[PDB]
RNA sequence: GAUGAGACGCGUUUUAGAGCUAGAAAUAGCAAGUUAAAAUAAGGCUAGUCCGUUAUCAACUUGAAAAAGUGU
């Protein structure tokens, strides 16, 4: 009667299976709706949903913001036009109208063809006089002559539209703008980050060197030449090299495995810096920020060589002229044959390309460099083709550096000069400047009025907000409050409680204590290294951490242990080299206020937390400044400004109430209190939280479905997978007659080796690598890798191994397969005979460790083995395996650490368990189990239920099934261990209590909980223990596993050829088209950029994106007779067209050219709609004009296992006795290849229909029949890409590359059967489209 | 580990920047070029200095919609 659901949640699929008490997969009959002759199908309740990955809302956000900016910029220019209106109407009635219509061709143009003046003569004159806008800007700033009001507008507009950046806050002065001051600022931050090996900025004239009109690398060399202790490739060297615009690599500066090459002038820089900071710490932020600021200062110095900008651009125009004329002259002089290509052909990256073709400065310089090197009359030109000042346009990328204060300046100059000639410029000068100056603050957000899902702000008036009445119309206070209310992230650990800023004092204390409390100190006077205890820790903090930003091991041992704990010789085992933790904000704000009194007062702590909070949330000057209102008196008004200048960015992961708020029920000590001072054995935040002895865990445990999902901490993709999972379960509940299941099992699916082995072999006699060379091509073959991690010696006996005889040697497990399944290197060794470990069922013998420990420690120093491996190798020296270690093994094997999974299990529980008893207690009908993937995967490998993902999509379903099997079998065999994997408030039962101290009620002595599936249990000795044929639970009498029948049942389920694979059908969403604006062309294919703008004249977009195709049955006109021919067509509705179509489809279709449309036969066909054709061949709809493979090749499980085994000829299992037999199983079945290729062939000939590629791959197969079995196998695993579901893709078989075979015709589906599938695929609705037509 | 607010600078597309000599023209010889306006998802009603590329979506039935139903 009862049943269970097994699930395998993924980002691209959801596996699901239904099982019964005998571990069988039911088969049922389902109705088939539609209009075919089929009315029922028999289907197995096993299957998998497939779906495209969910996307992150970023690109959508970037677009949103960019849109906002364009509207607001246009609004600016519209303000400026609003001011100049009347007087311009007095001067030129149709100036602005000429401006709007600047775009239109002369034909569509209502007014005179020339925008500025309205006459050919005045226009040509104007352009001849001022070849650029900058000339005119300079003339308008420097001359006292009255000028045409139109040129006033044009200048002011060209300065208000493009109003420069706003990075520098307040007015411009040398302290924030000049190369030198920012250089000493940079070195100040660097020195602050080190203080040891510092840099002096005293004798360095950086202002002259960095701003010199010489190349970047030259300025680099010149600067590092002034620094003797530093090299060009140094950290500082790469910082300046970064600031000049070069591309330094920080791989060498910080010993990373991967290279990290930064370049400020790239769009991807922000993220690359993010990765760099991820790998080296958040201590280096201000440094790189300073480096950037310096870069902008340098660039601004390169462009500003009154109106300095306009002037320099003018000089640039002139230089461009001189160098161009000289260039052309020289070219005609030396190569007249190539002049026509360089100055006329736009298709080439020449000047004709640089100006008309669309090439960039870089492409241009790349093009003409070899020519200039071939002409040899061009040395100064080549000199110019560097340093970024040759043939330059006035508008390029460097222009980002120009602050808004420059433009405000020149704008103000022009405004002052013509101030007297026009009273309205005088009266409205501050208005204009405000238009240029005003910038909406972060905390304000979109100036909405209730119709924005993003905005929050509040208005003081009912007026349209302008840059002039902004200040007293926006409720800055309420808006800031709401801004706070929104931006506060809550702690996942503690909801309803916001998280501390990443730079809060409490947070820094927290991380310091957390990293410090795990330090163990050892001295000769003491027996063994233990922790520091409270007095010592607080002492180290008080003396060291609040006097120094960076703490050195030398500073720890010599400036504490030597001067307090008397210890002369100490050894620290807790931390390496230095402390990662720090008290940065403490020391920075200390340097700010210079008042240790308020700092350590502990009463002022709250006030400080509020101060740093405000400094983190906001960045606007005024809102920052309002944060002095409560704290103006408490501090001297002098220091206060320096406090306002300090800004902190970033957020923590933990709240206040979690760190120092919530406290244990019993002990009454909070997390921080219980962390600061423990007894001899210290507790970490990793072990305080999930501990069952304390209140914390139970405290952590204590809305709509959408909210439940969105609150989760996971990618939008996995949230998609999770919603699909919930839906699948709901439908499966519907299929089983609305009966909820017993159980729902959930599963959620390198040079480092070479580095460690070369470093490690370097720490010792490195003769092994010099005598036996090896590259990472030999990679990580286990036995070789271990042969090198062990210096070519036996880990158990003192003897020098041989490379040529590795196949005789076997790998052994430190903690045997009987206790814990661990196949990593951290639990594997290499020896001539596994018998050399000893004769114990436990860890290797005492005889061995006592005779080999020295060697092991030798390996430990060389970091060849980790602490864990050394500990587990020398465990007989402490007895062996204990009860704590076994309880540990259980908790390791059984607990899923991932929090997303616990929250998904919580969701399904909250959905399935809805009934309450006579008390007020949760009636728990359905048990939601959580599985680790290692369980089912190892279960596969143990009993040869092998997985080969490349064959078909069944493995998802098989995985959900096996998840149900192992999950429920575990809940039946070990019910006491429920609270460790089943979701809910159960009893803990203290795992330690469930394990036997020695053999012969207890659950197990051998802690591999997955032992009871086996008939035999092989021990370290080779001693083969035996187990019942039928496993049953003691205290219940229930039978859990029949090692005879149930494996046959599983093997049966996995081999069922009918699995419900369903691909979620999806309306396409996104951009209307490709984003490139194409030149005007005589085609009716281009899309209008604006309603009226005919693309044949103005250009437009290409390649629109189709939302979904639609089936239309109607008639069209054919011939000169315009006779109605009835047709049935597949029409794609594009994303742009969609709103209009769905609003009223019949008029859309009639306007499209269709007459007498069958409204009831308009069938919506989303992407991946399924069509079945002849012989059971299927196709999915990819667009309105291409199809995808729709069938699944169900390869018999024997072939699958054969392919797994043969492809893994180098099988690293657990035994070498069975492995050889596996290899013999491969060699014995060589006909299997031929059979497999026969299956692939039959399937191919029937459903994929690619005759060419099949013939090619068949010939290429039969030709290589004499090739080894392993090769043929893995190549066939490739060959499966011919038959795979989805889009055709190219694949390689041996050397022969088989190109993809697309299905470009879409018509065949018009007379096929549309199959509407539910999410399980169990419910179908089949529509015969050949029955539909024009009567 | 997702989600959000502010701003810049490129790019691109049309248009304005009279091309000149011969030759009747076709077409060849040459002169040049660096700038600007405008748009920057078509657009939307809720008309905001707002919103418009995420999430969500088999079929059928009932609903304006949220969403309920339908198949041993």
XYZ file of N, CA and C in Angstrom, chain A residues 1089-1292:
612
model
N 14.072 51.296 -35.459
C 14.624 51.689 -34.169
C 13.659 52.567 -33.418
N 12.797 53.226 -34.171
C 11.697 53.996 -33.622
C 10.545 53.836 -34.601
N 9.314 53.992 -34.128
C 8.131 53.664 -34.923
C 8.176 54.211 -36.343
N 8.565 55.473 -36.465
C 8.527 56.184 -37.733
C 9.785 56.014 -38.580
N 10.874 55.593 -37.953
C 12.172 55.605 -38.615
C 12.363 54.430 -39.563
N 12.056 54.649 -40.837
C 12.198 53.620 -41.863
C 13.640 53.135 -41.946
N 13.855 51.847 -41.658
C 15.173 51.208 -41.641
C 15.895 51.268 -42.979
N 15.154 51.383 -44.074
C 15.780 51.462 -45.389
C 16.520 52.790 -45.561
N 16.189 53.756 -44.710
C 16.844 55.057 -44.707
C 17.713 55.267 -43.468
N 17.251 54.778 -42.319
C 17.890 55.086 -41.039
C 18.573 53.891 -40.380
N 18.395 52.703 -40.942
C 18.971 51.511 -40.348
C 18.142 50.943 -39.213
N 18.578 49.806 -38.685
C 17.871 49.174 -37.593
C 18.487 47.871 -37.141
N 17.668 47.048 -36.489
C 18.119 45.811 -35.861
C 17.895 44.581 -36.724
N 18.625 43.522 -36.417
C 18.558 42.287 -37.174
C 18.353 41.104 -36.226
N 18.003 39.945 -36.772
C 17.848 38.721 -35.990
C 17.046 38.911 -34.722
N 15.724 39.016 -34.832
C 14.926 39.116 -33.614
C 14.866 37.785 -32.884
N 14.489 37.821 -31.616
C 14.384 36.605 -30.842
C 12.935 36.164 -30.799
N 12.700 34.896 -31.119
C 11.364 34.319 -31.127
C 10.947 33.851 -29.741
N 9.795 34.306 -29.274
C 9.263 33.868 -27.998
C 8.747 32.445 -28.121
N 7.828 32.250 -29.044
C 7.298 30.936 -29.277
C 6.680 30.892 -30.645
N 6.683 29.728 -31.273
C 6.078 29.608 -32.578
C 4.600 29.413 -32.376
N 3.806 29.642 -33.402
C 2.385 29.457 -33.248
C 1.888 28.741 -34.499
N 0.904 27.867 -34.336
C 0.347 27.143 -35.465
C -0.878 27.859 -35.945
N -0.858 28.206 -37.226
C -1.939 28.927 -37.866
C -2.509 28.133 -39.015
N -3.823 27.947 -38.996
C -4.538 27.367 -40.116
C -5.448 28.426 -40.713
N -5.187 28.778 -41.966
C -5.978 29.776 -42.666
C -5.688 29.735 -44.152
N -6.062 30.809 -44.845
C -5.822 30.938 -46.282
C -4.995 32.180 -46.597
N -4.250 32.115 -47.689
C -3.472 33.249 -48.149
C -3.786 33.549 -49.617
N -3.273 34.661 -50.126
C -3.451 34.988 -51.530
C -2.276 34.474 -52.347
N -2.562 33.849 -53.480
C -1.503 33.390 -54.364
C -1.763 33.842 -55.800
N -0.689 34.165 -56.512
C -0.771 34.523 -57.916
C -1.334 35.910 -58.175
N -1.389 36.287 -59.452
C -1.982 37.555 -59.869
C -3.491 37.525 -59.682
N -4.040 36.320 -59.592
C -5.470 36.145 -59.396
C -5.871 36.391 -57.954
N -4.878 36.384 -57.063
C -5.103 36.530 -55.628
C -6.105 35.492 -55.141
N -5.981 34.274 -55.659
C -6.882 33.189 -55.291
C -6.513 32.654 -53.920
N -7.521 32.343 -53.113
C -7.281 31.839 -51.772
C -6.850 30.385 -51.805
N -5.611 30.139 -51.407
C -5.122 28.788 -51.222
C -5.044 28.539 -49.726
N -5.664 27.463 -49.264
C -5.663 27.161 -47.843
C -4.300 26.618 -47.440
N -3.744 27.148 -46.353
C -2.419 26.745 -45.892
C -2.406 26.427 -44.410
N -1.361 25.721 -43.998
C -1.112 25.423 -42.604
C 0.355 25.674 -42.337
N 0.646 26.748 -41.609
C 2.017 27.215 -41.451
C 2.462 27.318 -40.006
N 3.772 27.335 -39.823
C 4.381 27.533 -38.521
C 4.995 28.926 -38.417
N 4.359 29.804 -37.654
C 4.788 31.190 -37.544
C 5.388 31.504 -36.197
N 6.556 32.132 -36.188
C 7.201 32.523 -34.948
C 6.836 33.920 -34.482
N 6.317 34.023 -33.268
C 6.006 35.310 -32.676
C 7.195 35.810 -31.874
N 7.825 36.876 -32.332
C 9.008 37.405 -31.678
C 8.652 38.089 -30.373
N 9.649 38.323 -29.528
C 9.406 38.889 -28.210
C 8.805 40.278 -28.298
N 9.201 41.021 -29.321
C 8.627 42.330 -29.558
C 7.174 42.202 -29.988
N 6.899 41.231 -30.864
C 5.573 41.043 -31.441
C 4.591 40.513 -30.424
N 5.113 39.854 -29.402
C 4.299 39.052 -28.499
C 3.156 39.752 -27.785
N 3.409 40.923 -27.234
C 2.374 41.626 -26.498
C 1.202 41.911 -27.413
N 1.521 42.438 -28.587
C 0.531 42.732 -29.611
C -0.224 41.493 -30.065
N 0.493 40.394 -30.290
C -0.151 39.161 -30.719
C -1.123 38.658 -29.670
N -0.672 38.533 -28.434
C -1.516 37.974 -27.388
C -2.655 38.900 -26.999
N -2.510 40.186 -27.305
C -3.584 41.142 -27.056
C -4.751 40.846 -27.976
N -4.456 40.673 -29.258
C -5.464 40.304 -30.238
C -4.821 39.585 -31.415
N -4.796 38.241 -31.363
C -4.085 37.386 -32.320
C -4.661 37.383 -33.736
N -5.977 37.436 -33.865
C -6.574 37.312 -35.181
C -6.248 38.519 -36.051
N -6.230 39.707 -35.464
C -5.893 40.897 -36.234
C -4.396 40.935 -36.534
N -3.599 40.391 -35.623
C -2.163 40.284 -35.829
C -1.883 39.404 -37.029
N -2.550 38.261 -37.062
C -2.377 37.299 -38.130
C -2.954 37.805 -39.444
N -4.066 38.532 -39.390
C -4.652 39.079 -40.613
C -3.760 40.152 -41.211
N -3.180 40.979 -40.346
C -2.258 42.016 -40.775
C -0.967 41.392 -41.259
N -0.684 40.194 -40.769
C 0.498 39.452 -41.178
C 0.324 38.907 -42.582
N -0.925 38.810 -43.019
C -1.221 38.363 -44.364
C -2.152 37.170 -44.432
N -2.759 36.814 -43.309
C -3.610 35.637 -43.269
C -5.080 36.008 -43.345
N -5.828 35.245 -44.132
C -7.258 35.466 -44.295
C -8.031 34.258 -43.778
N -9.162 34.513 -43.124
C -10.015 33.460 -42.574
C -9.232 32.519 -41.676
N -8.800 33.014 -40.525
C -7.986 32.220 -39.615
C -8.834 31.337 -38.704
N -8.403 30.097 -38.499
C -9.088 29.227 -37.557
C -8.647 29.574 -36.148
N -9.455 30.355 -35.438
C -9.041 30.850 -34.136
C -8.852 29.718 -33.130
N -9.592 28.628 -33.291
C -9.527 27.533 -32.335
C -8.350 26.625 -32.595
N -7.706 26.806 -33.735
C -6.615 25.930 -34.106
C -5.290 26.625 -33.978
N -5.324 27.868 -33.510
C -4.109 28.601 -33.189
C -3.449 27.916 -32.008
N -2.387 27.169 -32.276
C -1.787 26.366 -31.210
C -0.472 26.972 -30.770
N -0.304 27.179 -29.472
C 0.901 27.814 -28.955
C 2.021 26.804 -28.841
N 3.142 27.063 -29.502
C 4.246 26.117 -29.492
C 5.545 26.709 -28.960
N 5.758 26.617 -27.638
C 6.955 27.078 -26.941
C 8.166 26.279 -27.348
N 9.353 26.712 -26.958
C 10.567 26.000 -27.307
C 10.574 24.655 -26.623
N 11.078 23.652 -27.328
C 11.122 22.265 -26.876
C 9.739 21.599 -26.828
N 8.815 22.028 -27.680
C 7.577 21.298 -27.864
C 7.914 19.987 -28.519
N 7.186 18.938 -28.150
C 7.521 17.579 -28.569
C 6.598 17.072 -29.648
N 7.174 16.537 -30.712
C 6.401 15.975 -31.798
C 6.828 14.536 -31.994
N 5.867 13.634 -32.140
C 6.179 12.252 -32.482
C 5.775 12.009 -33.906
N 6.604 11.258 -34.610
C 6.410 11.035 -36.026
C 6.268 9.543 -36.345
N 6.943 9.085 -37.390
C 6.894 7.681 -37.749
C 7.863 6.879 -36.904
N 7.574 5.596 -36.740
C 8.496 4.653 -36.117
C 8.946 5.052 -34.723
N 8.204 5.949 -34.095
C 8.543 6.392 -32.756
C 9.661 7.410 -32.703
N 10.006 7.964 -33.856
C 10.957 9.060 -33.946
C 10.344 10.359 -33.448
N 11.096 11.121 -32.663
C 10.567 12.338 -32.052
C 11.447 13.547 -32.325
N 10.846 14.726 -32.290
C 11.568 15.957 -32.537
C 11.124 17.027 -31.568
N 12.051 17.867 -31.128
C 11.682 19.016 -30.316
C 11.820 20.311 -31.110
N 10.921 21.249 -30.868
C 10.942 22.527 -31.551
C 11.938 23.483 -30.898
N 12.980 23.868 -31.632
C 14.010 24.794 -31.141
C 13.707 26.250 -31.509
N 13.099 26.436 -32.665
C 12.637 27.745 -33.083
C 11.454 27.518 -34.006
N 11.190 28.442 -34.913
C 10.156 28.202 -35.907
C 10.789 27.566 -37.138
N 12.088 27.278 -37.055
C 12.827 26.799 -38.208
C 14.001 25.863 -37.996
N 14.072 25.200 -36.849
C 15.066 24.143 -36.659
C 14.599 23.174 -35.586
N 14.947 21.900 -35.714
C 14.500 20.909 -34.748
C 15.652 20.282 -33.971
N 15.346 19.724 -32.805
C 16.324 19.011 -31.999
C 15.951 17.546 -31.859
N 16.953 16.705 -31.640
C 16.727 15.298 -31.380
C 15.807 15.133 -30.185
N 14.809 14.275 -30.311
C 13.846 14.117 -29.242
C 13.815 12.747 -28.595
N 14.654 11.833 -29.061
C 14.594 10.474 -28.565
C 15.691 10.126 -27.590
N 15.435 9.115 -26.768
C 16.394 8.629 -25.795
C 16.848 7.208 -26.091
N 18.137 7.012 -26.325
C 18.662 5.674 -26.561
C 18.768 4.886 -25.262
N 17.896 3.897 -25.097
C 17.871 3.078 -23.892
C 18.783 1.888 -24.042
N 20.024 2.044 -23.621
C 21.015 0.999 -23.787
C 20.947 0.054 -22.610
N 20.801 -1.248 -22.886
C 20.704 -2.292 -21.868
C 21.821 -2.193 -20.848
N 21.506 -2.400 -19.579
C 22.451 -2.152 -18.501
C 23.757 -2.936 -18.612
N 23.738 -4.088 -19.276
C 24.969 -4.859 -19.413
C 25.965 -4.111 -20.288
N 25.457 -3.461 -21.326
C 26.298 -2.667 -22.201
C 26.830 -1.451 -21.456
N 26.016 -0.905 -20.560
C 26.409 0.275 -19.809
C 27.525 -0.056 -18.850
N 27.376 -1.168 -18.147
C 28.408 -1.597 -17.221
C 29.677 -1.980 -17.961
N 29.521 -2.626 -19.111
C 30.676 -2.964 -19.930
C 31.440 -1.715 -20.335
N 30.712 -0.670 -20.711
C 31.345 0.568 -21.137
C 32.024 1.266 -19.972
N 31.395 1.247 -18.805
C 32.031 1.825 -17.629
C 33.326 1.109 -17.306
N 33.279 -0.218 -17.298
C 34.439 -1.013 -16.922
C 35.565 -0.865 -17.929
N 35.248 -1.030 -19.206
C 36.266 -0.964 -20.244
C 36.866 0.431 -20.348
N 36.051 1.464 -20.168
C 36.587 2.819 -20.211
C 37.443 3.094 -18.987
N 37.210 2.343 -17.916
C 37.995 2.523 -16.704
C 38.935 1.344 -16.508
N 39.723 1.042 -17.532
C 40.625 -0.102 -17.498
C 41.592 0.061 -16.338
N 41.904 1.314 -16.026
C 42.716 1.623 -14.863
C 41.776 1.840 -13.685
N 41.104 0.757 -13.297
C 40.116 0.764 -12.223
C 40.740 0.787 -10.833
N 40.579 1.908 -10.141
C 41.039 2.035 -8.766
C 39.901 1.734 -7.807
N 39.783 0.473 -7.406
C 38.680 0.045 -6.551
C 39.077 0.005 -5.079
N 39.120 -1.200 -4.524
C 39.542 -1.407 -3.151
C 40.335 -2.692 -3.045
N 40.333 -3.463 -4.128
C 40.990 -4.766 -4.173
C 41.652 -4.989 -5.528
N 42.764 -5.742 -5.560
C 43.404 -6.122 -6.823
C 43.102 -7.565 -7.219
N 42.331 -8.260 -6.390
C 41.929 -9.626 -6.690
C 40.705 -9.617 -7.594
N 39.783 -8.701 -7.315
C 38.573 -8.580 -8.111
C 38.826 -7.786 -9.392
N 39.690 -6.779 -9.307
C 39.970 -5.898 -10.440
C 40.437 -6.648 -11.681
N 41.414 -7.530 -11.498
C 41.915 -8.356 -12.585
C 40.766 -9.125 -13.224
N 39.835 -9.575 -12.391
C 38.685 -10.315 -12.881
C 37.756 -9.386 -13.653
N 37.718 -8.117 -13.260
C 36.932 -7.135 -13.988
C 37.532 -6.980 -15.374
N 38.857 -6.960 -15.428
C 39.555 -6.751 -16.685
C 39.355 -7.967 -17.571
N 39.202 -9.121 -16.933
C 39.010 -10.358 -17.667
C 37.571 -10.398 -18.161
N 36.687 -9.722 -17.432
C 35.292 -9.595 -17.835
C 35.206 -8.704 -19.065
N 36.087 -7.711 -19.120
C 36.157 -6.841 -20.281
C 36.697 -7.576 -21.499
N 37.841 -8.240 -21.344
C 38.441 -8.987 -22.455
C 37.589 -10.150 -22.964
N 36.879 -10.818 -22.061
C 36.032 -11.941 -22.451
C 34.855 -11.504 -23.312
N 34.337 -10.309 -23.045
C 33.197 -9.787 -23.789
C 33.617 -8.723 -24.795
N 34.195 -9.156 -25.908
C 34.657 -8.227 -26.928
C 33.615 -8.090 -28.026
N 32.670 -9.024 -28.062
C 31.580 -8.965 -29.027
C 30.644 -7.830 -28.650
N 30.714 -7.445 -27.379
C 29.900 -6.362 -26.842
C 30.056 -5.049 -27.597
N 31.259 -4.771 -28.086
C 31.491 -3.590 -28.902
C 30.625 -3.625 -30.154
N 30.709 -4.734 -30.879
C 29.950 -4.918 -32.106
C 28.453 -4.812 -31.838
N 28.022 -5.382 -30.718
C 26.612 -5.348 -30.363
C 26.177 -3.913 -30.074
N 27.015 -3.188 -29.343
C 26.735 -1.809 -28.976
C 26.606 -0.928 -30.205
N 27.593 -1.025 -31.093
C 27.572 -0.278 -32.345
C 26.341 -0.672 -33.157
N 25.929 -1.929 -33.067
C 24.707 -2.343 -33.741
C 23.482 -1.632 -33.168
N 23.442 -1.466 -31.848
C 22.317 -0.773 -31.209
C 22.288 0.701 -31.604
N 23.449 1.348 -31.515
C 23.602 2.734 -31.938
C 23.179 2.912 -33.389
N 23.523 1.940 -34.217
C 23.172 1.962 -35.628
C 21.681 1.828 -35.874
N 21.032 0.880 -35.202
C 19.596 0.677 -35.393
C 18.830 1.916 -34.961
N 19.173 2.398 -33.772
C 18.576 3.610 -33.249
C 18.769 4.742 -34.229
N 19.994 4.909 -34.705
C 20.301 5.966 -35.656
C 19.472 5.902 -36.927
N 19.495 4.748 -37.580
C 18.758 4.543 -38.815
C 17.280 4.814 -38.628
N 16.785 4.609 -37.415
C 15.358 4.772 -37.184
C 14.927 6.183 -36.817
N 15.687 6.878 -35.976
C 15.184 8.132 -35.424
C 16.036 9.387 -35.648
N 17.357 9.288 -35.661
C 18.118 10.511 -35.851
C 18.196 10.876 -37.330
N 18.267 9.870 -38.201
C 18.299 10.058 -39.660
C 19.452 10.908 -40.186
N 20.665 10.586 -39.757
C 21.865 11.195 -40.311
C 22.706 10.141 -41.016
N 22.321 9.809 -42.242
C 22.959 8.738 -43.001
C 24.463 8.949 -43.198
N 24.841 10.186 -43.502
C 26.231 10.525 -43.761
C 27.128 10.234 -42.561
N 26.819 10.860 -41.432
C 27.615 10.691 -40.227
C 27.612 9.260 -39.713
N 26.507 8.552 -39.904
C 26.456 7.164 -39.472
C 27.385 6.318 -40.329
N 27.337 6.509 -41.645
C 28.232 5.776 -42.540
C 29.694 6.068 -42.221
N 29.991 7.345 -41.997
C 31.345 7.777 -41.684
C 31.850 7.139 -40.402
N 31.041 7.200 -39.350
C 31.478 6.677 -38.064
C 31.486 5.147 -38.040
N 30.653 4.521 -38.863
C 30.651 3.070 -38.959
C 31.926 2.593 -39.632
N 32.289 3.232 -40.742
C 33.528 2.881 -41.430
C 34.717 3.121 -40.516
N 34.734 4.290 -39.884
C 35.821 4.645 -38.981
C 35.878 3.708 -37.778
N 34.746 3.095 -37.438
C 34.712 2.104 -36.369
C 35.286 0.774 -36.811
N 34.791 0.260 -37.930
C 35.195 -1.060 -38.384
C 36.659 -1.082 -38.798
N 37.171 0.072 -39.215
C 38.578 0.188 -39.582
C 39.499 -0.018 -38.379
N 39.058 0.445 -37.214
C 39.866 0.377 -36.000
C 39.467 -0.792 -35.106
N 38.954 -1.860 -35.705
C 38.461 -2.988 -34.927
C 39.594 -3.721 -34.215
N 40.805 -3.596 -34.745
C 41.967 -4.253 -34.159
C 42.563 -3.437 -33.013
N 42.030 -2.237 -32.798
C 42.488 -1.364 -31.719
C 42.169 -1.980 -30.354
N 42.866 -1.536 -29.290
C 42.590 -2.100 -27.964
C 41.154 -1.850 -27.518
N 40.676 -2.625 -26.552
C 39.286 -2.528 -26.121
C 38.964 -1.210 -25.416
N 39.861 -0.758 -24.550
C 39.637 0.461 -23.784
C 39.422 1.670 -24.700
N 40.249 1.762 -25.734
C 40.178 2.860 -26.684
C 38.840 2.868 -27.405
N 38.464 1.711 -27.945
C 37.194 1.556 -28.645
C 36.030 1.920 -27.731
N 36.128 1.513 -26.471
C 35.102 1.819 -25.488
C 34.917 3.321 -25.314
N 35.965 4.013 -24.871
C 35.838 5.446 -24.606
C 35.433 6.200 -25.863
N 35.866 5.698 -27.009
C 35.472 6.318 -28.260
C 33.994 6.104 -28.552
N 33.438 4.983 -28.109
C 32.013 4.770 -28.303
C 31.237 5.674 -27.349
N 31.766 5.854 -26.145
C 31.181 6.809 -25.211
C 31.129 8.188 -25.860
N 32.152 8.537 -26.629
C 32.025 9.743 -27.439
C 30.895 9.595 -28.441
N 30.878 8.464 -29.139
C 29.958 8.238 -30.247
C 28.499 8.421 -29.839
N 28.226 8.310 -28.549
C 26.869 8.508 -28.051
C 26.322 9.913 -28.257
N 27.171 10.857 -28.651
C 26.725 12.234 -28.868
C 25.975 12.365 -30.190
N 26.033 11.309 -30.990
C 25.268 11.217 -32.218
C 23.791 11.029 -31.911
N 23.509 10.296 -30.836
C 22.153 9.867 -30.514
C 21.523 10.648 -29.368
N 22.335 11.429 -28.665
C 21.898 12.170 -27.482
C 20.676 13.042 -27.717
N 19.843 13.170 -26.697
C 18.690 14.055 -26.743
C 19.135 15.506 -26.820
N 18.393 16.321 -27.557
C 18.677 17.741 -27.638
C 19.235 18.171 -28.973
N 20.071 19.198 -28.954
C 20.620 19.752 -30.182
C 21.767 18.908 -30.693
N 21.878 18.785 -32.018
C 23.029 18.119 -32.623
C 24.320 18.847 -32.292
N 25.376 18.094 -32.021
C 26.671 18.680 -31.729
C 27.760 17.854 -32.382
N 28.895 18.479 -32.663
C 29.994 17.775 -33.303
C 30.714 16.898 -32.302
N 31.248 15.774 -32.762
C 31.980 14.895 -31.859
C 33.125 14.192 -32.569
N 34.124 13.757 -31.811
C 35.278 13.100 -32.403
C 35.295 11.616 -32.091
